[PDB]
Design a protein around this ligand. Structure first.
Ligand SMILES: N[C@@]1(C(=O)O)CO[C@@H]2[C@@H](C(=O)O)[C@@H]21
Ligand SMILES: N[C@@]1(C(=O)O)CO[C@@H]2[C@@H](C(=O)O)[C@@H]21
Ligand SMILES: [Ca+2]
Ligand SMILES: [Ca+2]
Ligand SMILES: [Ca+2]
Ligand SMILES: [Ca+2]
Lengths: 745, 745
C-alpha cells in the first residue's frame, strides 16, 4: 500500500528493488542502499528534467506510479496488478503508458508475461538475460543493456588469454543464473576448456547451506579459479562461507558481483585479487549534485527515504543528527547503472513525443487521437526505432547514442575490474571488451603474488589420453617419440639424444658396426707381448753366429704380431671375403715356413719328397692366390648385433670381420695351417719330438680358441687376444725350433 | 471465446490441453485425442455422477467453467483471467470455488502464481514436478500424483539392476525437463553411474533441429542406452529424427513418453524394445460405457467434439458417415490418467461437503455463511486433510484411498513397460516400483536380442584410473598384482601362476637355488666317458700280469668319475664348507697317489726323502682332516642368482655349491693337488718326462677350467663338464704312468 503517486497528463510505472529480500517468513528485509534508493531517485531526477524541457513534450506533463518489488517475482506480480486494474474492467482511471522494468531477470520475465496481455510497452534497465530476446514470446519488451550472450564470451576469453583450462563453476538459481552458465559452457567447448565441477546455490530444495559447495570446490585442488554467475545476495554469502573455512581461490565473477564495495565487507582477504566484469558506463555529473542536496526534511515525496536515512547513519528520528551533514563525497559514490536508468526514461519520452508530433501536428497538447493509446503502434512503430544522443553525457564516442536493435537490446561492451589494497581496499579497471578482449596484465594484483595456473594434468616421455587430462609415460632409450603422443621404436645403432623426436647420433658401434676407439689402447698393451716375441725371435736369429729357412719361419712368427695388430690395410680388414683369405694366409704362412723347415731340408727319409713339398706349398699358394684375388673389398665391418641396444664393438680401428666372412675365414685359416700339422702328425728323430711337442700345444691352443671363435662381446676382444695368444703359442714353437739346434757355435 | 459454461450453485474451473500446440505463428494446431478430449469428458462424467449423488452435496448443484490451454503457459494465463475477473473488481458475478489444474508442469506453475493472489485452491492431475512442493511459494497447490523426486529414483535403479554405468541423457525444456534431469544426476552419483553426454531440446534458442542431438548421441558409441526426460511433443520428433538416420539405441523414458501407441506411429522399428515408466493406475470401467455412447448429435454441450469426430474418422460434416459406428473397442482404449482426473474432482466435492456440514448443520442448502467463501479455510483446514475411498474403483489395496500428505502430493508408485511385437506392436507391463524395484527380466524383448551393455572401458594386467574409465595395462611375469589396481613386483625364485594376486610356484631354481632335474640326464651322458676311464684304468691294471701304489693312483683317477658324479652324500654336496673341503680332498687324493708314486718308491736320489714324503702327505691329511671335520652341513645349494628371473640351475640332483663356498673350495682343491705338481716341477729320468709331459697338460687344462671356474649359466654345466674333463685329463696322466712301465711281462 506504500507507493509514490504524482498525477499528470501521462503516467509512467516503475519497479525497483527498494527493499532487500526478507530473511524468513517476513516479506522483505532491510533497505537496498545502492541498487535501491539511488536508482529510484534517478527516475525521479529524470522526470523533473523532462518536465523542465521545452523540445521534449512541452505541452503534456509526465506522471509517475512507482512501486517496490522487494526482490521477489511473486511480490512483483502482486504489485503489478495496479497497472492493469483500470484497463481490465471498462464496461459499466489511471492508464499506464509504459513500465520501467525491474532489475532482476526473474522479475522482468514475470511481469513481461502479464503486461503483454494488455499491450503495455516495457523497457528494463540492468536486466541481462539471453532468453528475454525471444520476441515470439516477449513481443512488448526492450532494454538498454546488452544480453548475457556477450558476457559469456568476455569471460571465456579471459580464461583463454591466461592458460586457465581446468576451472570450476558456481551458478545461482532463477533465470540470470542457469541461462548465464548454460551459455558459458558452450563458449568453453570452442576453446577446449574443461569444467572440474558445476554447483548451484539458492534458497529452496538445493541443499548447500553455502558450505557443501565450498567443500566441493576444495575436492579438486587442481582448479584454482572459480567462475561465478550469481546474484548480489549469494555473492555475499559464499564469500562469508569461504572466510570461515579460511579457503582462498581467484574469483572470476560476472556483473552480478559487479564492482560493489559492500559484498566484500568484513571478509576482504578472501576476495583480494578478484577479477570481475561490469557494464561500460560513465557517471552522470548532474545526478551527484541532486542526490547530495537531499535530506529527510525537504524530501517529503519519498516515503522510503526515512528508513534509508537512519540505516545509512545509524541514527533515529541508537542515538537520536539534526546538524548532521547530508550526503556528500565522504560517504557516497554513484552506482554504475544510473546512466542506463536515465536512458530508459528518456526512451519513453522521445517515443511518446514522436507520437504527439504525428497524431496531433496542430497542437502541443493532447489531441483527441491520444484519448486511447495504441500499445502496439507505440511499441512496434515508434519505440523500437528511436535514435537520439544520450542526455547529460558529453560526446564520448559511439556509446553516446541511445538505440535499440532488431531484438530490442543494447550494445555488448564491458569492463574488467580487480580488487586491490593500498589497508584500505578498492577496485581498479584493468581491462575492456568491445568484441575483442584488450586487458593490461602488468597492473593486476594477483591473489598469491603470481599468475595462477589451473590445468588438469602436468606437462622424452609419451603422453596419451577429454582434452585436458593426460598421463606422462616415459619410454626406454631405444624408442623415439614419433609424435608428442607416441614413442614406438628407434634405430639399431643410432642413439637418440635430448628430445627423442627422431633417432640421432648414428652409432658406429651397433654390433653389426664396430665402434672401436678402445681396442687400439688394448692393442698397444697387447703389442708389447707381440714385440717380445719379435724381440725374442731377433735374439734367436743373432745366436746363429738351412739358415735362411729358419729366418723365414721367424718371419712368419714375427708376422703374427703384425697380423695380430692388423687383425690392416683398412680400419676393418676382416670385411670382405679377401680379408678373411688374407688373414688366413698369414696363419698358414707361419705354418708353411715351419712345415717347409720340418722335412723339406731334412734329407729325404724311427719307422715313422719333391711331390709332397710341391703339394704342401700348392695349398698355401692357392690360399694366398685366393687372398690375392680379394685385394679389393678388403675393408668392412664385423656383424655381432645382439638384442642389447648399446653394442659398440670395441676393437682396434673399429670392429671389422665381415660378419660371417670372418667365421669362415677363421676356420679356413686353421685348415691352411692344419696341412702342415697333419703332415707332421704322421710320424708316430729328436726334431720330430720337438715338432710333435709343439704340435701337441697347438691342438690345445686351438681348443681354447674354439670357445673364443664362437664367443664375442670384451669377449670378442678376449677372443681377439686368444688369436694373438695363438700366434704367441706358435712363437713358442719357434722357441722349440731354436732348441732343435746345437750350442757352442 | 470458446468454452463450456454450465451454471450452478457452485462453479468449478478446469484447464485441459484440448488443442495441440501450433506449428508456427498459429496459436494451437490439431486436436489432442487422448490427453485432450478424453480427459475433458472425464471431468464432465464425474460432475454428472456427483449431481446424481445423495450423500455428496445433495442440496447444492455443481457448475463448471472449462477452458483450453493449447499446451502453452502464455495462452493459459490469458484464459485464466476469467476465473479472477469477477473477484478483482467488487466495489461500485461467477465466483470460482476451485480450479482443476493443468496437465503440463509449466502451465500449472504459471497459473498457481496468479491464483495464489486470490486464495483459490487448485488440484492438478498429471503434473509431476519437484519444485511444485515448495509450499513457501505455492501455498494453494495440491495434486493427486507423486512428484518427480520418485521418478528419478525408479530409473536410477533400473540402470543399476542391469550394469549400465555409461549412459547419455536427453532432456526437454520447461520445468518438467530440467528439474527432472537435475534430480536424476544426483541419484546417479550415489550409484557410481557416469553420464556420457547431456543434451537439451525445445523450440527457441537451443539449436538442435533434432538432428544435432542424434549425431551427438552417435559420437559416443560406448553408451548404448539413452535416458529421456521429455514431453510428448519432443518424443515423437526425436524418434522420427532417429528413423531418418536409421540409428538404433535402447530407450529408457519417463512418463512423458508413457505408454502411448501414437508416439511411435510410422517409426516403430527405431523404438522396438524400449523401456518406459508410467504411473500406477486402474481403468475406470464406468467411464468406458459413457464414452462409447457419444456421437456428434447428442453431445451438444461439447463445442470441440465436432473437430474431434472428423479428425478421428477422416470424415466431414474428404468423404462426407451417418450410419458410421460410434466409439467402440475396435478403435478406442482408455488413457492411463483418467483415474487421477476423476479423483481430483471428488477432492473438491468432499472438501466442500465437509464445509457445508460444519458451517450449515441445520440445512442441506447454501446457508448465508457460504455467501463469501474463505479460500484459506477451505484449503488449509478442509481440503488438505481429506480421506475417502476412491469411487468407481473396487478395493485394490492401499491405492484405493485418496489422500494428500504434508506437501499436498501423492504416493510414489510406478510401472515398467516394454514395447514388443507379435507385425502388430503393443506394450506389456514387465515391472513395478513401490519403494523397491521389482521387475521380471525373462519376458523382456530386447532391441538386439541380447541384454545391452554400456560401460566406459572394457575389463594378469593392472588397471588404474572418474569411476567408470580405466586403462588395462599388463605387467611383466616378474611382478604380481598386489591389488586389482597395482602390480609392483614378485618373488625371486617363485614363478606366479594364473592370476598374479600373489607370488606362487616356489621355484627350486632361482640362481641361488638349483632347479636341477636335467643335469642328471647330462650326468648320465657324461658318466659314459667317466666309465671309459674306469674301464680303461681297469684294463691297465689287468696288464700287470710298487704294484699297490699304481692301483692306488688308479683309484684316485677312478674316484674322479665318482667325484664328478657327486660334484654326493646329499643332492647338493657342494653346500657347506665341508663339502668344498670334501671335494677338494678328492682332487688332491688323485694327485697325492700320483705324487707318492713319483718319488716315494723311486729309490732316494740328471742333475735335477722321508721328511719330504711326510710333509707332502701331511698337506693331504690336513685337507682331508678339514673336510672330515665338515661332515655335517654337507648339503646345500649353489648361489648363481642373475638379473634374469628364470634362473633354474640345471644340475644333477639340483645345483649345490654353497655359493662362494664352492669358489673357495675349487681354488683350495687346486692348491692341494698343486703341491704334487709343484714338487715334480723341480726336476728341470724317462719317468720324469712322462710326469713332466703330463704336468704340462695339467697346467693347460687348469687354464681352460679357469674361465669355466668363473663362468656359470649350461655354462655352469659346461663348466661342470670342464671339471669332469680335468679328471679325464688327469686320467690321461695315468695312461702316461702305464706308459712308464715295461712290456713283455
Ligand atoms: N545482471 C543482473 C540481473 O538481474 O540480470 C544480476 O543481478 C543484478 C541486477 C542489477 O544490477 O540491478 C543485475
Ligand atoms: N509428467 C508430464 C508433466 O507435464 O508434468 C510430462 O508430460 C505429460 C503430462 C500428462 O501426462 O498429461 C505429464
Ligand atoms: Ca526487481
Ligand atoms: Ca534472477
Ligand atoms: Ca495444460
Ligand atoms: Ca513442461
Amino acid at each position: 500500500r506504500r507507493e509514490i503517486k504524482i498525477e499528470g497528463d501521462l503516467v509512467l510505472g516503475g519497479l525497483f528493488p527498494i527493499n532487500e529480500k526478507g530473511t524468513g517468513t517476513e516479506e522483505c528485509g532491510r533497505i537496498n542502499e545502492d541498487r535501491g534508493i539511488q536508482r529510484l531517485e534517478a527516475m525521479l531526477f529524470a522526470i523533473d528534467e523532462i518536465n523542465k524541457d521545452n523540445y521534449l513534450l512541452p505541452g503534456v506533463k509526465l506522471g509517475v506510479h512507482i512501486l517496490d518489488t522487494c526482490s521477489r517475482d511473486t511480490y512483483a506480480l502482486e504489485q503489478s496488478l495496479e497497472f492493469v486494474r483500470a484497463s481490465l474492467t471498462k464496461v459499466d482511471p489511471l492508464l499506464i503508458a509504459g513500465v520501467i522494468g525491474g532489475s532482476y531477470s526473474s522479475v522482468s520475465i514475470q511481469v513481461a508475461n502479464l503486461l503483454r496481455l494488455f499491450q503495455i510497452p516495457q523497457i528494463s534497465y540492468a536486466s541481462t538475460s539471453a532468453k528475454l530476446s525471444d520476441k515470439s514470446r516477449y513481443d512488448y519488451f526492450a532494454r538498454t543493456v546488452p544480453p548475457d550472450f556477450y558476457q559469456a564470451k568476455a569471460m571465456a576469453e579471459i580464461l583463454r588469454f591466461f592458460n586457465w583450462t581446468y576451472v570450476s563453476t558456481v551458478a545461482s538459481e532463477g533465470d540470470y543464473g542457469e541461462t548465464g552458465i548454460e551459455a558459458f559452457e558452450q563458449e568453453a567447448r570452442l576453446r577446449n576448456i574443461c569444467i572440474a565441477t558445476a554447483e548451484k546455490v539458492g534458497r529452496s530444495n538445493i541443499r548447500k547451506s553455502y558450505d557443501s559447495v565450498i567443500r566441493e570446490l576444495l575436492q579438486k585442488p587442481n582448479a584454482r579459479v572459480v567462475v561465478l554467475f550469481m546474484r548480489s545476495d549469494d555473492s555475499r554469502e559464499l564469500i562469508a562461507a569461504a572466510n570461515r573455512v579460511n579457503a582462498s581461490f581467484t574469483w572470476v565473477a560476472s556483473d552480478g558481483w559487479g564492482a560493489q564495495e559492500s559484498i566484500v565487507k568484513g571478509s576482504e582477504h578472501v576476495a583480494y585479487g578478484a577479477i570481475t566484469l561490469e557494464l561500460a558506463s560513465h557517471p552522470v555529473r548532474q545526478f551527484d549534485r541532486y542526490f547530495q542536496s537531499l535530506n529527510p526534511y525537504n524530501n517529503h515525496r519519498n516515503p522510503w527515504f526515512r528508513d534509508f536515512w537512519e540505516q545509512k547513519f545509524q541514527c533515529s528520528l541508537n542515538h537520536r543528527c539534526d546538524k548532521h551533514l547530508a550526503i556528500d563525497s565522504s560517504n557516497y559514490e554513484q552506482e554504475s547503472k544510473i546512466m542506463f536508468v536515465v536512458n530508459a526514461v528518456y526512451a519513453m519520452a522521445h517515443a511518446l513525443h514522436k507520437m504527439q508530433r504525428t497524431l496531433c501536428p496542430n497542437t502541443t497538447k493532447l489531441c483527441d487521437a491520444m484519448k486511447i493509446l495504441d500499445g502496439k503502434k507505440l511499441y512496434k512503430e515508434y519505440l523500437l526505432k528511436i535514435n537520439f544522443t544520450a542526455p547529460f553525457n558529453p560526446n564520448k564516442g559511439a556509446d553516446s547514442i541511445v538505440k535499440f536493435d532488431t531484438f530490442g537490446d543494447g550494445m555488448g561492451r564491458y569492463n574488467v575490474f580487480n580488487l586491490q589494497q593500498t589497508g584500505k581496499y578498492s577496485y581498479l579497471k584493468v581491462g575492456h571488451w568491445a568484441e575483442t578482449l584488450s586487458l593490461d596484465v602488468d597492473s593486476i594484483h594477483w591473489s598469491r603474488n603470481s599468475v595462477p595456473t589451473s590445468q588438469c594434468s602436468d606437462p622424452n616421455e609419451m603422453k596419451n589420453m577429454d582434452v585436458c587430462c593426460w598421463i606422462c609415460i616415459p619410454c626406454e632409450p631405444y624408442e623415439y617419440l614419433v609424435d608428442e603422443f607416441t614413442c614406438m621404436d628407434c634405430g639399431p645403432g643410432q642413439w637418440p639424444t635430448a628430445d627423442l623426436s627422431g633417432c640421432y647420433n648414428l652409432p658406429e658401434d651397433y654390433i653389426k658396426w664396430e665402434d672401436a676407439w678402445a681396442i687400439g689402447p688394448v692393442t698397444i698393451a697387447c703389442l708389447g707381448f707381440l714385440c717380445t716375441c719379435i724381440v725374442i725371435t731377433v735374439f734367436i736369429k743373432h745366436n746363429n753366429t738351412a739358415s735362411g729357412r729358419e729366418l723365414c719361419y721367424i718371419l712368419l712368427f714375427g708376422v703374427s704380431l703384425s697380423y695380430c695388430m692388423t687383425f690392416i690395410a683398412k680400419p676393418s680388414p676382416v670385411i670382405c671375403a679377401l680379408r678373411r683369405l688374407g688373414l688366413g694366409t698369414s696363419f698358414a704362412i707361419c705354418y708353411s715356413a715351419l712345415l717347409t723347415k720340418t722335412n723339406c731340408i731334412a734329407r729325404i727319409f724311427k719307422n715313422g719328397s719333391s711331390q709332397v713339398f710341391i703339394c704342401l706349398g700348392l695349398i698355401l699358394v692357392q690360399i694366398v692366390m685366393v687372398s690375392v684375388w680379394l685385394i679389393l673389398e678388403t675393408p668392412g665391418t664385423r656383424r655381432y648385433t645382439l638384442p642389447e641396444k648399446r653394442e659398440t664393438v670395441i676393437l682396434k680401428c673399429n670392429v671389422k670381420d665381415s660378419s660371417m666372412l670372418i667365421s669362415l675365414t677363421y676356420d679356413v685359416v686353421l685348415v691352411i695351417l692344419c696341412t702342415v700339422y697333419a703332415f707332421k702328425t704322421r710320424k708316430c728323430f729328436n726334431e720330430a719330438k720337438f715338432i710333435g711337442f709343439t704340435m701337441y700345444t697347438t691342438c690345445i691352443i686351438w681348443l681354447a680358441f674354439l670357445p673364443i671363435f664362437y664367443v664375442t662381446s670384451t669377449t670378442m676382444c678376449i677372443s681377439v687376444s686368444l688369436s694373438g695368444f695363438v700366434v704367441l703359442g706358435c712363437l713358442f714353437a719357434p722357441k722349440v725350433h731354436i732348441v732343435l739346434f746345437q750350442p757352442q757355435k
